[PDB]
Amino acid sequence: DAQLKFANDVESRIQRRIEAILSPIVGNGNVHAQVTAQLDFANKEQTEEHYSPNGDASKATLRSRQLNISEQVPRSTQRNETSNYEVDRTIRHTKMNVGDIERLSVAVVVNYKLPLTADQMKQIEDLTREAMGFSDKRGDTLNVVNSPFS
Amino acid sequence: DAQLKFANDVESRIQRRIEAILSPIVGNGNVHAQVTAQLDFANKEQTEEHYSPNGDASKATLRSRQLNISEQVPRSTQRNETSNYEVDRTIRHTKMNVGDIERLSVAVVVNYKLPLTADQMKQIEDLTREAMGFSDKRGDTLNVVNSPFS
Amino acid sequence: DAQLKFANDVESRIQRRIEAILSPIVGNGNVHAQVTAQLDFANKEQTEEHYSPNGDASKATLRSRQLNISEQVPRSTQRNETSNYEVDRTIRHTKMNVGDIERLSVAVVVNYKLPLTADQMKQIEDLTREAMGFSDKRGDTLNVVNSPFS
Amino acid sequence: DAQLKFANDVESRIQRRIEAILSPIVGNGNVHAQVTAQLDFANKEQTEEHYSPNGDASKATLRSRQLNISEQVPRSTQRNETSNYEVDRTIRHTKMNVGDIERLSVAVVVNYKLPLTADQMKQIEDLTREAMGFSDKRGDTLNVVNSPFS
Amino acid sequence: DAQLKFANDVESRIQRRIEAILSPIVGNGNVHAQVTAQLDFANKEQTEEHYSPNGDASKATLRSRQLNISEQVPRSTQRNETSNYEVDRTIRHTKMNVGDIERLSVAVVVNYKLPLTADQMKQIEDLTREAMGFSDKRGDTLNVVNSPFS
Incomplete structure (x- = not known):
């Protein structure tokens, strides 16, 4: 019932934050991200x-x-x-608590400008990792790819 | 429900503080920051x-x-x-207490002016670390990157 | 809920005190400070x-x-x-008591006038340390940096 | 809640006393002081x-x-x-009693007139120490510095 | 709450007494004193x-x-x-009793007339010591300094 709405809100928060931090570097709207949150609701x-x-x-x-x-x-x-x-x-x-984040997964696309170099890609990956709330404990996964838009 | 609003308020506090301390050095609006707070609500x-x-x-x-x-x-x-x-x-x-900060993660972008040197970058990183409330106990993470704006 | 307001009040007190003591030496408005207070609310x-x-x-x-x-x-x-x-x-x-200060962290920027010397910087750091309520027991941290304003 | 107001009152008392004793020696308004009081409210x-x-x-x-x-x-x-x-x-x-002073810290700035000598500085430090209610038991800290005003 | 008012009254008594005894020797208003009283309110x-x-x-x-x-x-x-x-x-x-004096500290400034000699200074210190209610048991502290007024 409401669990989907709560998960959608959390995903929207993380997505808007990632896009708002990564936009000033690469441009106004040359990046998109979608996150999938594995929430846990088991009373414990x-x-x-x-x-x-x-x-x-x-x-x-x-x-x-x-x-x-x-x-x-x-x-x-x-x-x-x-x-x-x-x-x-x-x-x-x-x-x-019921409603914590057990695992995340983030996929981000960045635009050409025509390839972006390796150092800039690495620092962008690192910014995204830090803006997620990344944690190798929960088994989170990130992957940023560069491909021309259309 | 309200946990998201409380976390958003804490993140807004830390973000406005970091930007307000780092603005007079680098300029009016040549810096942005986004923070992700891992809050804990488990009654204990x-x-x-x-x-x-x-x-x-x-x-x-x-x-x-x-x-x-x-x-x-x-x-x-x-x-x-x-x-x-x-x-x-x-x-x-x-x-x-229910509502403490268990872990933080901060990502900051600084503008060119054209590269900023290494000493200025290090002191800016240090200012940010001190303005966060940084603590190697909680496993907090910081990363400041320099890239031209657009 | 109200914990954020209480912490904000404490931080405002310490900030206004530091600025009011350090202003007569360096000038009217050539210094800024931002403090982050780790408050404890656990009933004990x-x-x-x-x-x-x-x-x-x-x-x-x-x-x-x-x-x-x-x-x-x-x-x-x-x-x-x-x-x-x-x-x-x-x-x-x-x-x-619920509401004591467990740890502080202060970041201060001072203006050029053009570098300020080392002795003046050291005495300014010492004034700030004494005006904070500094204590190496709580693990407090201070860092004052000098950089031209804009 | 009210603890901040009580602490502010105590600090105001000590500050006005220090300034009122040290003013007749150095001048009308050529000295400023700010004190930070570590109060204790734990019922015991x-x-x-x-x-x-x-x-x-x-x-x-x-x-x-x-x-x-x-x-x-x-x-x-x-x-x-x-x-x-x-x-x-x-x-x-x-x-x-709830509301005693566990520790103090005082920072005082004195004006030039152009350096003030060492003996006068030492006697001014001593006057301040005696006017505080200084006590090496509580771990109190004092530091008086001389720097030209502006 | 009222403890500050009681302490202020005691300090005012001792201050007016010291000034009233020391005035006829040195002059109408060529002396000032400020006292800090460590009162004890712990029911015992x-x-x-x-x-x-x-x-x-x-x-x-x-x-x-x-x-x-x-x-x-x-x-x-x-x-x-x-x-x-x-x-x-x-x-x-x-x-x-709740409200006794556990410790005192007195600072007195005397005017030039141009230095005052050593014998007169010693007898003035002794008058002040006797007018305080001095007691080496409580650890009381006195210091009288001579410096030109302005």
């Missing part, structure tokens, strides 16, 4: 519970203790040891 | 509970104790020791 | 509980005691010792 | 509980006692000793 | 509980006693001794 909760290790005796936190030591001499021995500890704790209750 | 709580180590006998905090020591002479021995401790404690209840 | 509590160490017998605080000592002569021995202590205590309930 | 309580040491037998406060001593002659011995003490105590309930 | 209670030592047998206060002594002759012996004491006690409930 979470509850971590982290404990810091207290195995090493250097920073254990003893609340109690009992250390009995017998020794006879045929060197019989004995060593009992009860220990009650205290432990750190961290608890988060993260309730994710 | 937290509860730490930290304990200071009292393993070392130099600063333990004994509440009780009982130290029995027998010894016969065939040097039989014995050593019992019960200890009850007291421990420090820290407890925080951090309820994060 | 805390509860410390500190205990002073009473391990050393020089300043323990005994409430009770029982020290039995037997000895026979084959020098058999015995030594029992029960001890009940009293301990210091400190308890704070710190409820942090 | 506290509860100490101090105990004076009674380990040394020179000033213990015995409420009871029981000292049994047997001895046979093969010099067998015995010594039991129960002791009940009384201890001093101090208890404070300090509820800190 | 207290409860001491002091016990006088009764370890020494010279002034113990026995309520009961039981001293058994056996002796056989191989000189076997025995000595049991139970003692119940009575102890002094002092209890204060000090509820501090």
Whole structure:
């Protein structure tokens, strides 16, 4: 129902931003872009519970203790040891948001003026990458191609 | 719904600030910038509970104790020791805010006047970095390019 | 919602103060500054509980005691010792404030008059640092650059 | 909300005081100052509980006692000793105030008349330090610079 | 809120007193002073509980006693001794006042007439110190400087 409208709005934002940043370099209307946004709407909760290790005796936190030591001499021995500890704790209750951007894909066409060089193409690709909100974490994809218009 | 409007407002703030600081150096309208803000809306709580180590006998905090020591002479021995401790404690209840900036990305175009030199470009990049609120913690990204306008 | 307005007010205060202190040295309007304030709105509590160490017998605080000592002569021995202590205590309930400044970033442009020397630039940087409320604890950043206006 | 107004009032007080003390020496309006006050609004309580040491037998406060001593002659011995003490105590309930000054930073410009000498500059710095309410505990910072006005 | 007004009143009192005592010596209006009062508003209670030592047998206060002594002759012996004491006690409930002066700082300028000598300066400093309510306990600070007026 409304999910399509929300996705369309996000795509329109990113498209107008890319065109508005790249227009002053190449011209008024010699560039077009279309973006496809993979939105996620799955309601999601979470509850971590982290404990810091207290195995090493250097920073254990003893609340109690009992250390009995017998020794006879045929060197019989004995060593009992009860220990009650205290432990750190961290608890988060993260309730994710419905409507985030999980992945993007952008295709941009640039006009001749007649080929545009390689350095200018690379810097234009870089401007677009930075204007998208690019992130190699989400697996985003970009491809800018140069071909004469008609 | 409103998340897009809030993000648009934040982006507009940062954009107008960058342009207003960089305009007096390069000219009235010979620079443009577009920023993409990755906002986070996930409701999040937290509860730490930290304990200071009292393993070392130099600063333990004994509440009780009982130290029995027998010894016969065939040097039989014995050593019992019960200890009850007291421990420090820290407890925080951090309820994060919904609407913070998790990551930024800024693309800026500067005009010729005809190339601008390298030192001026570097100081302009540095001004922009400082005016953004840049932070290598959040993974922010900046790229300023110089190309003739049309 | 209102967080942007509060941040804008804080930034306006710091900006007007920096410009008002630096204007009489360099001129009426030959300087501009823009500041970006990283505000924190996360509601936060805390509860410390500190205990002073009473391990050393020089300043323990005994409430009770029982020290039995037997000895026979084959020098058999015995030594029992029960001890009940009293301990210091400190308890704070710190409820942090929502709306503090976690980090600042300031960019300032100064006009030619034609380069300004190095000593004057250093003292101007120092005036700005002192007028900000600078603090190397919060990780604040400052950068003042000199470039001709237009 | 109102925290900014309170901070502005405190800063105005300190600024007018510094200017009013330093004006009669250097002139009517040949000095300006701007101060940045780091105020603290975190609600804070506290509860100490101090105990004076009674380990040394020179000033213990015995409420009871029981000292049994047997001895046979093969010099067998015995010594039991129960002791009940009384201890001093101090208890404070300090509820800190919301709105104190945690740190200050002052920047002052003085006019030529043409350089002002070093001794006069040092005594002016000292007057300002004393008029601020300076304190090396809070980490306050002062810097007075001399530069011709325009 | 009102704390600033109370502090201003205290400062005005001390300032008018210092000027009124120092005026008849140096002249009608050839001296100015400005004081900065560090007031404390933290609500504070207290409860001491002091016990006088009764370890020494010279002034113990026995309520009961039981001293058994056996002796056989191989000189076997025995000595049991139970003692119940009575102890002094002092209890204060000090509820501090909100609005006391924790620290002062005074800066005074005196006019030429042309330097004023060292003895007169020292006695003027001493008059000011005595008129303040000076106290090396609170860490108060005074500095009087002589410079020509304009």
